Short mmCIF file of C-alpha atoms and ligand atoms in Angstrom, two decimals:
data_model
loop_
_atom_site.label_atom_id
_atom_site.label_comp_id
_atom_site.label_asym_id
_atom_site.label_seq_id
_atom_site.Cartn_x
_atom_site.Cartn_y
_atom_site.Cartn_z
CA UNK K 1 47.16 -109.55 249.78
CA UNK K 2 46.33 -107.52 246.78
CA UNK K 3 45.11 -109.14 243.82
CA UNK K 4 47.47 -110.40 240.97
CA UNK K 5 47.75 -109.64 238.07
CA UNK K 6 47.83 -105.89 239.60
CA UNK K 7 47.59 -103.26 237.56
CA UNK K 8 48.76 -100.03 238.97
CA UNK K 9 48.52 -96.68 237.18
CA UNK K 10 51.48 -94.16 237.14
CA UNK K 11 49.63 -90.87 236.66
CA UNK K 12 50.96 -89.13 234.22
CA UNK K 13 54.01 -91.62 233.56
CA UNK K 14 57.03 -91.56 234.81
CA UNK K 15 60.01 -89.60 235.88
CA UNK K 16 63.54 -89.42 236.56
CA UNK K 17 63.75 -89.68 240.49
CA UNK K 18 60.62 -91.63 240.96
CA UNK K 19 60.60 -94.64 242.91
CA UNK K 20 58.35 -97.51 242.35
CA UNK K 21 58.52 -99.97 245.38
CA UNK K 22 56.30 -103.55 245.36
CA UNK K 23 56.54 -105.94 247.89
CA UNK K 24 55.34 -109.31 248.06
CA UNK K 25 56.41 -112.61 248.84
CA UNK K 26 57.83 -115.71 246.27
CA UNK K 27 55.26 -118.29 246.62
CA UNK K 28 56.61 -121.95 246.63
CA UNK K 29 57.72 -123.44 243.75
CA UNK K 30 57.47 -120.81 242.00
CA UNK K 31 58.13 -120.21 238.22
CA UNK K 32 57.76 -116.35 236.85
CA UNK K 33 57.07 -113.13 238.34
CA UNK K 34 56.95 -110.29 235.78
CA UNK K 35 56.31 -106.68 236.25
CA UNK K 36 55.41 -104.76 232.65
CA UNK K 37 56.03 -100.63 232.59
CA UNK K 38 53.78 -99.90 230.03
CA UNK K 39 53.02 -97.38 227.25
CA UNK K 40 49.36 -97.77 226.32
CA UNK K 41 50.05 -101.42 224.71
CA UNK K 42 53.31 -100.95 224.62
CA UNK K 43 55.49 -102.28 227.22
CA UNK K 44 58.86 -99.90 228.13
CA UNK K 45 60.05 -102.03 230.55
CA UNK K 46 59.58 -105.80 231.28
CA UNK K 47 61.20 -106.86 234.22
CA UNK K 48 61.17 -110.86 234.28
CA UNK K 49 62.14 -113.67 236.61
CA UNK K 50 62.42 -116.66 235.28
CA UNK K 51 62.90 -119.60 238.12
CA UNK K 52 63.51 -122.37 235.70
CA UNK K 53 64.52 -121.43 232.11
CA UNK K 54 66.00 -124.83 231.15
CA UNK K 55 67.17 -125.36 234.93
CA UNK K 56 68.78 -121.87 235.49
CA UNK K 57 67.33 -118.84 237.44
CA UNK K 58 67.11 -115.32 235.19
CA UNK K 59 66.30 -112.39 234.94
CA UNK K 60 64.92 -111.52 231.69
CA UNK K 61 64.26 -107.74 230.55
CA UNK K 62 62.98 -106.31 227.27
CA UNK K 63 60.53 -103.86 225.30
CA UNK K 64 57.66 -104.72 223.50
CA UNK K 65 56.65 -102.14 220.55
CA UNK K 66 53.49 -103.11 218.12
CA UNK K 67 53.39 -106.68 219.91
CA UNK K 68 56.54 -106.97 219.30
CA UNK K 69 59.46 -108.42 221.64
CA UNK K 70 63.04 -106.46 221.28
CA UNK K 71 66.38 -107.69 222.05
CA UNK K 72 66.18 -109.05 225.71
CA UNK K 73 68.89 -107.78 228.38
CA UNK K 74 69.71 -110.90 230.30
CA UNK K 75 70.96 -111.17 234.03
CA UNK K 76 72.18 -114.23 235.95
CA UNK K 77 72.27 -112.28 239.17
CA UNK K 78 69.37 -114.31 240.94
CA UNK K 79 68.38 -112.31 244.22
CA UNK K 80 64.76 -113.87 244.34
CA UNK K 81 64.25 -117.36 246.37
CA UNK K 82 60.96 -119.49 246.66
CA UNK K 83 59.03 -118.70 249.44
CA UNK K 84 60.90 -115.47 250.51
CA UNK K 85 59.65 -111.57 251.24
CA UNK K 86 60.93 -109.59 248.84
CA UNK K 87 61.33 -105.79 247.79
CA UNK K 88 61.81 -104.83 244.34
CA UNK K 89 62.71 -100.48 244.06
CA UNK K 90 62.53 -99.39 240.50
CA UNK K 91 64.15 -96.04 240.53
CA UNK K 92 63.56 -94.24 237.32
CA UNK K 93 66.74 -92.06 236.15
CA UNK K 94 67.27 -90.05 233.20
CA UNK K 95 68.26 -92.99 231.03
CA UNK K 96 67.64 -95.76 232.46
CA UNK K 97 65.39 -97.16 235.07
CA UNK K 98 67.70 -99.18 238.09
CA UNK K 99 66.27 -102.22 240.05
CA UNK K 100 67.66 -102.90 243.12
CA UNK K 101 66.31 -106.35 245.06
CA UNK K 102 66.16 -106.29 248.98
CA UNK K 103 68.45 -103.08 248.95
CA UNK K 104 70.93 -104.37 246.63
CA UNK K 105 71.85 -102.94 243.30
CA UNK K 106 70.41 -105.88 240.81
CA UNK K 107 70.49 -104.13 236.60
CA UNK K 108 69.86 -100.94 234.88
CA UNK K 109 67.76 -101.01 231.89
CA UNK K 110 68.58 -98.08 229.09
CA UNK K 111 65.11 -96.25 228.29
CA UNK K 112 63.98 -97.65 224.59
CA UNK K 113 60.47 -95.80 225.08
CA UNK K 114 61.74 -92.01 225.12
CA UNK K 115 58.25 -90.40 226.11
CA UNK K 116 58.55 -91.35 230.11
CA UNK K 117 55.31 -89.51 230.88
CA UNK K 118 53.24 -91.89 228.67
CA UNK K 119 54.39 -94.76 230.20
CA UNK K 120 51.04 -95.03 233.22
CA UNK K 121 51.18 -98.05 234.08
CA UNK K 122 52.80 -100.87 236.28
CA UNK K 123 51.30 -104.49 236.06
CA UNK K 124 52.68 -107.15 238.54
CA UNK K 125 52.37 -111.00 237.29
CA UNK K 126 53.08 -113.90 238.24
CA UNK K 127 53.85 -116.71 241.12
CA UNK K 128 53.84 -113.76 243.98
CA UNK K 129 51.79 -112.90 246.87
CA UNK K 130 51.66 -109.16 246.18
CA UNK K 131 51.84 -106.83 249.87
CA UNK K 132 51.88 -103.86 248.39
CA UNK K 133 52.76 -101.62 245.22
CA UNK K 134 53.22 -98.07 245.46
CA UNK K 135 55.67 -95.00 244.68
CA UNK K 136 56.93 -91.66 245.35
CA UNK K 137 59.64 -89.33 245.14
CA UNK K 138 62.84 -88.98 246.16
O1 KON H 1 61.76 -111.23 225.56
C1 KON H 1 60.87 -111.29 226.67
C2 KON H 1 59.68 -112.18 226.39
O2 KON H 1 60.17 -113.52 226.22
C3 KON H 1 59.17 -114.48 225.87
S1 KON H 1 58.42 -114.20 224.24
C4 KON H 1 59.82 -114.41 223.17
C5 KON H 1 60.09 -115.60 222.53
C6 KON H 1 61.20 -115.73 221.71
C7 KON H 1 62.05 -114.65 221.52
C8 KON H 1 61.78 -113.46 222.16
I1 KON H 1 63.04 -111.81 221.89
C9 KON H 1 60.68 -113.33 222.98
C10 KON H 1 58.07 -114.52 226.93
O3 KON H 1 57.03 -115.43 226.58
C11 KON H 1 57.51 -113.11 227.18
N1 KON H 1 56.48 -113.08 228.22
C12 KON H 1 56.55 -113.44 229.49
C13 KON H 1 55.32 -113.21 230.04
C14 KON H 1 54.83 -113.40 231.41
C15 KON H 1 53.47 -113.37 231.67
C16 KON H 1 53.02 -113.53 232.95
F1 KON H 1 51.69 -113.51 233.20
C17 KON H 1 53.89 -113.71 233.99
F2 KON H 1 53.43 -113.87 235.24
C18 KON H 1 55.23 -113.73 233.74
F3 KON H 1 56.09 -113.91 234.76
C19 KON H 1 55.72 -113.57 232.47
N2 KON H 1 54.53 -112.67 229.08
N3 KON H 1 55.23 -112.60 227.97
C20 KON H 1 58.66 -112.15 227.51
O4 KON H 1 59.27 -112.52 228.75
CL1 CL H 2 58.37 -116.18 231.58
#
């Protein structure tokens, strides 16, 4: 297993028709997982499962600009279980980045942060055993 918190640079950012693909495995009772696009400090995309947010499982997304959280884009949609392999595919597209979970459509997520090639790295937090993080292009 790779070591988590991972933190995976995207040379030269990002762009439309890259794929970003991790794979890892829920570890028992587990609580968060959270991957973080970022922008120098900035984070363009947070991607967050949240396994027990006052007894519900979410998905949490949002933008952090100056240390500073944004509106948060909530979804109920819950494809992650304890103790499961899973695949998460960020595909980035020309205005938004789309998540789909074990090969099934899960949210879009508008871009806030407009400069995609400044936006180099990927870390990967959280209550995972990380396989493997990687991309390319399709
Ligand atoms: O809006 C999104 C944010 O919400 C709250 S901050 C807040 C409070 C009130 C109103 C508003 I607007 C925002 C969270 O604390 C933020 N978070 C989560 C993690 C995190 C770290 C890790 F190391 C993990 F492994 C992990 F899974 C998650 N770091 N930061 C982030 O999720
Ligand atoms: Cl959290």
């Amino acid at each position: 297993p790779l070591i988590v918190p991972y933190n995976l640079p995207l040379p030269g950012g990002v762009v439309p028709r890259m794929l970003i693909t991790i794979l890892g495995t829920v570890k028992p009772n587990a609580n968060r997982i959270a991957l973080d696009f970022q922008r120098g400090n900035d984070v363009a995309f947070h991607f967050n499962p949240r396994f027990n947010e006052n007894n519900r499982r979410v998905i949490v997304c949002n933008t952090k600009l100056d240390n500073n959280w944004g509106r948060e884009e909530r979804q109920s949609v819950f494809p992650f279980e304890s103790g499961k392999p899973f695949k998460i595919q960020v595909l980035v597209e020309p205005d938004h980045f789309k998540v789909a979970v074990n090969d099934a459509h899960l949210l879009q997520y508008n871009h806030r942060v407009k400069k995609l090639n400044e936006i180099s790295k990927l870390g990967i937090s959280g209550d995972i055993d990380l396989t493997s993080a990687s991309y390319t292009m399709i």
